Design a protein around this nucleic acid. Structure first.
Lengths: 150, 144, 81, 146, 129
RNA sequence: GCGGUAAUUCCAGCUCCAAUAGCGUAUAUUAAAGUUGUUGCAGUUAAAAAGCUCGUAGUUGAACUUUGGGCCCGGUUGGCCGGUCGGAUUUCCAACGGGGCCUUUCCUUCUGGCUAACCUUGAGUCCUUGUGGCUCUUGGCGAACCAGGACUUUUACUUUGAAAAAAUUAGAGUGUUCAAAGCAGGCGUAUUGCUCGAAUAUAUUAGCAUGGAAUAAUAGAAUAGGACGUUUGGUUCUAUUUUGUUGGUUUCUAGGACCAUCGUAAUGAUUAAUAGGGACGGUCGGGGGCAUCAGUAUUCAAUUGUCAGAGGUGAAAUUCUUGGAUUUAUUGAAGACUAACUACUGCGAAAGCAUUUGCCAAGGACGUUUUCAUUAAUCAAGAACGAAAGUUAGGGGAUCGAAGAUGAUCAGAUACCGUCGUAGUCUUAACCAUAAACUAUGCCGACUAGGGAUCGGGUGGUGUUUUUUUAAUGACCCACUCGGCACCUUACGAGAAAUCAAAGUCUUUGGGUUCUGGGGGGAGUAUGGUCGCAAGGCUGAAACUUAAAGGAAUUG
RNA sequence: GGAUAGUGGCCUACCAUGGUUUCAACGGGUAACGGGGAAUAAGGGUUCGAUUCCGGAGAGGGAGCCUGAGAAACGGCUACCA
């Protein structure tokens, strides 16, 4: 099932049958947009913005309440992250495993998990250069891997 | 499933896979390396004229016993010495040394028959007649 | 069985199924409306909440995130909506 | 995707039988001849106002466009005045009833009234062979995805 | 993963009708599937059926009735020159008086008798008898 | 297979059989051959799933974007139609789409060329009383057809047409006397001649005109450099036609293009895949690495205590013993190991991994009204890991221990049995790249049948318990759900069968895709190549030989 | 620019490093002239085509050239080799 495992699990998230309006909500649209931008300027990621708006504010999702989605409204208001955040988290994990390898050589199963992570980074980054949020080359490289995470 | 790539564009994969599985057929590689015109004793021929060198006692296989009265001949065109059977009864004594006989295949493409071991060939004529005619006494041999 | 209203199944059969195999795929997670005994403000709290839920007033925790449904802290008034 | 000066080589690049008369005051700055390519195709404005010569061009030039008309994308651009097309196409097979993907290459004479690069679906017609590979002159261009 | 949803849906149809149930559920759908099932319905292999617009795919619940021997696809949607449609229906149907292979004509999804009526052809999708 | 004494097979005769003016033979290609498989094979065991994942090529890829004709027909809602004690219908009837029939059938539009036919009137003549009837246009009707434009996302696909030399082939006419053949011939008024003929089909991809717009990809408009435009400027060219004409200059308008203004606009981003990648949560496991910690056992040593044996075996002998052997005890060292928990349990890509504790980074699953929105599936070349044996030098080196030594057993024992004993075992650094790496079952997907236990996560319970008191759990119980290693019954099914929930959803034959096999030996040999210190790895035939090699199962 | 019948790296000077390729280039085999077709035919195919026609190519091996509209002619010449 997964990209890189023997695992075939299905835990997921079902958006309810509503294109709009859990009508008991009754706060705003523009003010919760400003809520998003305030939490974003506090140094939050789109996913973490979404889960905090869910939990502490009862927000269903921004596509429902305000028409469009979160990274979209960030990319509108100019707080846009430079590399896409899931690629960012992949590179972060890659530098973590790479640090651990250069300090512990004989950990070869961790070198195999490193192989899989560099695999995911090449596949996803290949996609982002196809749909042109990267430059068309962007040259992801193992030695400058610390430069995007530090 | 089923193994093969059923794709509406997968024909080069299909055709390469077929071409390279063809060699395990005994006959596709056998023509296409060129193995008759290389190392079978004949060069694609069916008969060859040969020279008699020796008369051989090849003794038959296990559920038989007989001495088979074969002959050991040499080709003209190519120099190969090769066993050959002299067919039906009494026709060994129709052949003497260096009698320029005519060699045929034997009935199974180029493997043996029944209980002569290892032989491929047979004689049909001796110095320009026959063996059926000689065996049924309906032709007499010229003397060289 | 061979024949069953697969269009309209019983609510028992529907309640006993997973989030996705139900005929319309839909959530089970429900928002709550919580007042603390200290302050009086109403807070809308996700059932399976993933952050330590606090109120804007009085800075107390409301819900500890755990494995599945969020464990509320102590006795606080909550209405299931 | 480079260009050059007016005159570079050891000749003087002009067109044959075009005579910018020095005695009469040429109010216009040149006598630039051109033609219409036909097949519905349009001469670019850059060709008429331009300042190259390229005697092998269909425009302001001495060869002509006939024979097959074709299209294709551009895979190489690193020659001087020629690109390399890849006419991608599918080949049938009767036995397997299934197509198989295939390609050729057919390098054409990019004229310097046409700005091309890698990408750039072009349209290109046959033009009395120019060198050993190139029998085609580009007549119309278009971009790749954006 | 999810290659041809026509073979997925017909896979369920054939499996349920092999095992003697009376109706079936199908998770993905397509307007190719809808036009396959309208053709099976108006030739009379399927009773009612019902799109369920679950927002994702749209499941389809088909009230079968028996009277259906096989459905299937022919997985490359092969081209068919209009002479070769009889080579097909010979190759893969049980007789010469029933059974319908289903094209993809540019006049639409139809079956081979309607193909010879409207005098048009194209790919092949699958067959039903 | 016959032929080893009475041969239904040899050599003859007799009789017969078949093909017959022909019959046999050799060899080669074709059918047989679903034994080359695209249709159309096979891989658990018959030959045959790469040790395992990663991954470029190739091959493949969830869903979503509306439809000018009518005649007949049936199907649903329906109303004047309600008769029947709220249902009970017919059809004068719209349409709701649906099946045939002839066609609406079109190319989307300017620039005008040009109008077929006019809304007619330009008045009344020929003729039955005259919108009968033309000779005709001054107010209208362009597509009946032309060419300067702009429609312009490109195809793959399919329909139709022209080409698809002659023979060939399929076939139409024809009595070459039948015919194989040919393109002939046939009828009179045979005396001064009439005439039919010599078709048609087929051919393919590649083109080349043409319709179709489903399928299958491909472009847009997001950091609006957008289209609309009657707009308002400003720039540049542009360069016809009138200036007698030429050529130059400038007023002009036309035609591009570009740049700002206001205006026009529903201004513009398709789902959120029981697809996938990420985030966060509480968990979970003998996942890896480095420390660190412990245990008893074995062997060795010192210190004792005692008396003739101690091992060891099928029974013995090799050996050790009054210089105290074995045992006892005390204490220490040394190394490997991680039992009892120990299962039809877990984890890991597999090989594999079981002591504590810590760090280091990972990880599956579960939960998720979060996130991005096809980012995928499978993989030639390629790369990582890869039990154990090896091999290169260390440091260890206790126990077991190939080679070796002996003592046995034997007809012989350089074999099993006994006592030792090097390399090894262990580890650090470096190679190797193989195993029955075996679940002998590729991988991702969807469906098809009953059950109870199990591990991990979740949810519910007027549940139990712990106690200090109900509370907080945590454990236990009941029911569900996802994932997981398995299992137990039946066969709807599959199979040659043992057997199988996948080996099912296969002649009623096609979900994406990677490898593998084509009778047995020869032979994983030859040789060429590459890798390796080497042992050897991966690639890898031929000569020739033989009618079998086999696979489940029954009876002996 | 020359050459040519004429385009053309066909050749020469000069000036750039290009062009092809795992969608199989380049190199090797062949008992390789190709196509029309032939055989066998359920369908899908597989093998063959020196040979009665078209196109090619060669006149022992190899090059050169007169004549001529047309030949690198060989039932022409010249050179070498066999």
């Amino acid at each position: 099932g997964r990209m890189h495992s023997a695992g075939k699990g299905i835990s997921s998230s079902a958006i309810p049958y509503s294109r709009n309006a859990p009508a008991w909500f009754k706060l705003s649209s523009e003010s919760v947009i400003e809520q998003i931008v305030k939490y974003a300027r506090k140094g939050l990621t789109p996913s973490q913005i979404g889960v905090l708006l869910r939990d502490a504010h009862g927000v269903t999702q921004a596509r429902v309440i305000t028409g469009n989605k979160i990274m979209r409204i960030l990319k509108s208001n100019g707080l846009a992250p430079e590399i896409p955040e899931d690629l960012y988290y992949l590179i972060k994990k890659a530098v973590s495993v790479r640090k651990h390898l250069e300090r512990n050589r004989k950990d070869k199963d961790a070198k195999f998990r490193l192989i899989l992570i560099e695999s995911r980074i090449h596949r996803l980054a290949r996609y982002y250069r196809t749909v042109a949020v990267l430059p068309p080359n962007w040259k992801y490289e193992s030695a400058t891997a610390s430069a995007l995470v530090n | 499933g089923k193994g093969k790539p059923r794709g509406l564009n997968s024909a080069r994969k299909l055709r390469v896979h077929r071409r390279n599985n063809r060699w395990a057929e005994n006959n596709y590689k056998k023509r296409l390396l060129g193995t008759a015109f290389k190392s079978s004793p004949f060069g694609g021929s069916s008969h060859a004229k040969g020279i008699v060198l020796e008369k051989l006692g090849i003794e038959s296989k296990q559920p038989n016993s007989a001495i088979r009265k074969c002959v050991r001949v040499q080709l003209i065109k190519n120099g190969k010495k090769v066993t050959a059977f002299v067919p039906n009864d009494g026709c060994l004594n129709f052949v003497d040394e260096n009698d320029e006989v005519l060699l045929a295949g034997f009935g199974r493409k180029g493997k043996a028959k029944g209980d002569i071991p290892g032989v491929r060939f047979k004689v049909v004529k001796v110095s320009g007649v026959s063996l059926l005619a000689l065996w049924k006494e309906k032709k007499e041999k010229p003397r060289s | 069985v061979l024949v069953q209203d697969l269009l309209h199944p019983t609510a028992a059969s529907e309640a006993r199924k997973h989030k996705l195999k139900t005929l319309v795929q839909g959530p089970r997670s429900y928002f709550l409306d919580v007042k603390c005994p200290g302050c009086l403000n109403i807070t809308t709290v996700f059932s399976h909440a993933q952050t330590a839920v606090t109120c804007e007033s009085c800075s107390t925790i409301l819900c500890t995130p755990t494995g599945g449904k969020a464990k509320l802290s102590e006795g606080t008034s909550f209405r299931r909506k | 995707s480079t260009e050059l000066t007016v005159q570079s080589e050891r000749a003087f690049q002009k067109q044959p039988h075009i005579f910018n008369n020095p005695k009469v005051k040429t109010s216009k700055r040149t006598k630039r001849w051109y033609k219409n390519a036909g097949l519905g195709f349009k001469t670019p404005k850059t060709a008429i106002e331009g300042s190259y010569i390229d005697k092998k061009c269909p425009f302001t030039g001495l060869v002509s466009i006939r024979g097959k008309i074709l299209t294709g994308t551009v895979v190489s651009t690193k020659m001087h005045r020629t690109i390399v097309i890849r006419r991608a196409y599918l080949h049938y097979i009767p036995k397997y009833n299934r197509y198989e993907k295939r390609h050729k290459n057919v390098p054409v004479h990019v004229s310097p009234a046409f700005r091309v690069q890698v990408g750039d679906i072009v349209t290109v017609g046959q033009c009395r062979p120019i060198s050993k590979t190139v029998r085609f002159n580009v007549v119309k261009v278009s971009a790749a995805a954006g | 993963t999810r290659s041809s949803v026509l073979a997925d849906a017909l896979n369920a149809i054939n499996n349920a009708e092999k095992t003697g149930k009376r109706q079936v559920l199908i998770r993905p759908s397509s307007k190719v599937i809808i036009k396959f099932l309208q053709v099976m319905q108006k030739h009379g292999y399927i009773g009612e059926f019902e799109y369920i617009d679950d927002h994702r795919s749209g499941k389809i619940v088909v009230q079968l009735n028996g009277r259906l021997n096989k459905c299937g696809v022919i997985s490359p949607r092969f081209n068919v020159k209009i002479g070769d449609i009889e080579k097909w229906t010979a190759n893969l149907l049980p007789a010469r008086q029933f059974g319908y292979v289903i094209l993809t004509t540019s006049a639409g999804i139809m079956d081979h008798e309607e193909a010879r009526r409207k005098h048009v052809s194209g790919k092949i999708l699958g067959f039903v008898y």
